[PDB]
Amino acid sequence: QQDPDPSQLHRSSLVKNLQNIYFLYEGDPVTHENVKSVDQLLSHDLIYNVSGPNYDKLKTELKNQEMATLFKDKNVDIYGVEYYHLCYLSENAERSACIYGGVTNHEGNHLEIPKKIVVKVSIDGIQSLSFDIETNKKMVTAQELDYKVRKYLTDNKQLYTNGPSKYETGYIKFIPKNKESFWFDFFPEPEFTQSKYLMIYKDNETLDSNTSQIEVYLTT
Amino acid sequence: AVTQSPRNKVAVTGGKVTLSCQQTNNHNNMYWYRQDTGHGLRLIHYSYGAGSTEKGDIPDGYKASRPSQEQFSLILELATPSQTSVYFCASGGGRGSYAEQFFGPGTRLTVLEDLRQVTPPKVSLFEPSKAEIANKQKATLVCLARGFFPDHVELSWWVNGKEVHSGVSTDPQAYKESNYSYCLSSRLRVSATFWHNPRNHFRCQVQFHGLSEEDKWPEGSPKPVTQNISAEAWGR
Ligand SMILES: [Zn+2]
Ligand SMILES: [Zn+2]
Ligand SMILES: [Zn+2]
Structure with a gap:
């Protein structure tokens, strides 16, 4: 996954039923x-x-x-x-x-003590938000970390709502140790279904919770 | 089956309201509509299944949630008078066309500037016309309810303790008298012979839904909560 370009990010204002994304990350996994x-x-x-x-x-x-x-x-x-x-x-x-x-x-695959991963959130080109995520797995799927990132962002920063979003574009970037980084767009295409959008987790990509970074980039 | 809760609700402008729909048909599709006098049945929101909802034709002002297969809720974050209407829920099998849908009983929601306007009804029973009795062979009782607001009422007839629909003729809908007052009338016809038997009991029952416990009414004044008023009379 080569980092995205502004024109390569889906815009939330173009999504008719964006509440269907909200339900996925606001509710329990x-x-x-x-x-x-x-x-x-x-x-x-x-x-x-x-x-x-x-x-x-x-x-x-x-x-x-x-x-x-x-x-x-x-x-x-x-x-x-x-x-x-x-x-x-x-x-x-x-x-x-x-x-x-x-x-x-x-x-x-479990840890004696939960491993806390730092999530560096950047809004409008300015990394000004930072919070912690947690996992008790050595090898964890990107999906788990992703869900945890969005759940917090939805509960605290209103990434998603049962309606529109305060952010126009957004994505999560994963930085594994000695592997190619990859990202997920936070917003779907204008017309989507939950099953179609969730295909980003089909690859079952797993990470070393101990040596992996998480970056979030949003624009309002 | 499809049920709705609450069935009656008076809310204040700017307040939050939640209409809940429950089904036992195990249908994947659920719908929330609204109907306004003289106007049509319009779709607000619908859902193809648990954990998702779809915007209908007139979604503005409403949110929806489908926490499970059985439930479908319609949320009004900031109630406005324009949202006063009769809301209908429905479940649908197959593709969800009308022939495959099953509607709920409906919910009456009225949104006003303040609740100090809500008023229970005045109920009266009237004996058949003096002349009507003689060369009429038929006796007709007229039940009248008025001075109530809003219009969430039900009027029924009970002869000798058993509810009756035969011979009854009730106005299709409560008609407004003043800006904050409704009127509703009904008629019960019986054989003049029946109306002359002192053993026959006649009863006009009216139910008025006003404010609920959840509502807060300015202390000092009696709270106009639901009421069951009845007017009765015996056969002369
Ligand atoms: Zn385990
Ligand atoms: Zn795309
Ligand atoms: Zn009732």
């Missing part, structure tokens, strides 16, 4: 400790017999078959942003939730 695949629909996904307020089954589409069959029989930790509309898990049944990635191995 789906988190599950030490569990293992129970079923599978497509070659690149895994279904779990886990539960939450709105679901009895959870499906996670991963990067591909290779990655799917990799976590298939292991005991994993799940941490993702789920959607319900368009989450087909069979022909007849339902009460299912869907996510992308958000999967890490459970065994020996």
